[PDB]
Design a protein around this ligand. Structure first.
Ligand code: EMR
Length: 330
């Protein structure tokens, strides 16, 4: 079997991507944020505290004839961005672009933090990292990908995020018309439960490529590109007037600048992120200072190849016996 769904940026800056997901019987369609950096499928629901819901579509388990309450199971998650959510668990039929999983754990939110409430376009998350990070207690649950894997024509899912435009998440197959050249596969460590790999280096604009190992995670759930302070300082030093602002919480640059591109290595191959992809608009409405798309990971503890980097490539999340990541230009 296979699945294919369109993913769309929630706003003019590509702050996040939403993909329609069918849950329950009859189908309840919610727009979820596909997250390769987490492993919980959670939704805003009829049980979420009323004051914590503002515009989101909710899952009502009581209206689903296939929903079964998972006895005594609870979930609670805290993300790297300080956001959190928690609640109870149901098992239900979940479909992504024609691909169906029966008995998927659907984590119904009883509580969400303000960051989730203020994002009216995001009805919940769909975790695509390894099932070892799933927060369901006392019995850990599997991801949608993990549940569908055996049935898939090939044990893979692909992320093809668009820049200011719709994209695609495919399950079970590789669309050879969706990229140029070849896909370069690279080793993955699943020890931290992430699609963790090692980039072979970088280049800023037309500059000389620096061969250096950068360990990081392929994370569709993170908007920006988080890299070591040395690399990020080398990038912003090419932008006239750019500086790291402690009040804003990162590198900012004059909105009138044309940004240089950023290249990252995947083995001997290179993925070029165009400069416009690194522009995240005014720091505040009407400001002439803009927020940078490449930020230091010094406060995080891990490098994150978020949407800024992933949207420049066709990305294969290969869930074979030994998982690997594949990258191609497009
Ligand atoms: N609610 C602040 C965070 N969110 C995260 C996803 O994009 C929009 C902004």
């Amino acid at each position: 079997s296979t699945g294919s769904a369109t993913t769309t940026p929630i706003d003019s800056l590509d702050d996040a991507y939403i993909t329609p997901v069918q849950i329950g019987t009859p189908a309840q369609t919610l727009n979820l944020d596909f997250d390769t950096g987490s492993s919980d499928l959670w939704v805003f629901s009829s049980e979420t505290t009323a004051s914590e819901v503002d515009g989101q579509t909710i899952y009502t388990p009581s209206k689903s004839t296939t929903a079964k309450l998972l006895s005594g199971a609870t979930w609670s998650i805290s993300y790297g961005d300080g956001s959190s959510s928690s609640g109870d668990v149901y098992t239900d039929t979940v479909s992504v672009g024609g691909l169906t999983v029966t008995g998927q754990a659907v984590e119904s939110a009883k509580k969400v933090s303000s960051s989730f409430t203020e994002d009216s376009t995001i009805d919940g998350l769909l975790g695509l990292a390894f099932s070892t990070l799933n927060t369901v207690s006392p019995t850990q649950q599997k991801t949608f990908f993990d549940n569908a894997k055996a049935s898939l024509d090939s044990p893979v899912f692909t992320a093809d995020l668009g820049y200011h435009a719709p994209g695609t998440y495919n399950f079970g197959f590789i669309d050879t018309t969706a990229y140029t050249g070849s896909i370069t596969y690279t080793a993955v460590s699943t020890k931290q439960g992430f699609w963790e790999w090692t980039s072979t280096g970088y280049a800023v604009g037309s500059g000389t490529f620096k061969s250096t190992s950068i360990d990081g995670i392929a994370d569709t759930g993170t908007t920006l590109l988080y890299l070591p302070a040395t690399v990020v300082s080398a990038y912003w030093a090419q932008v006239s007037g750019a500086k790291s602002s402690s009040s804003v919480g990162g590198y900012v640059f004059p909105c009138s600048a044309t940004l240089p591109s950023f290249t990252f290595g995947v083995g001997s191959a290179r993925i070029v992120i165009p400069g416009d992809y690194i522009d995240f608009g005014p720091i505040s409405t009407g400001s002439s200072s803009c927020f940078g798309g490449i930020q230091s990971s010094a406060g995080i503890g891990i490098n994150i190849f978020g949407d800024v980097a992933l949207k420049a490539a066709f990305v294969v999340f290969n869930g074979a016996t030994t998982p690997t990541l594949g990258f191609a230009s497009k």
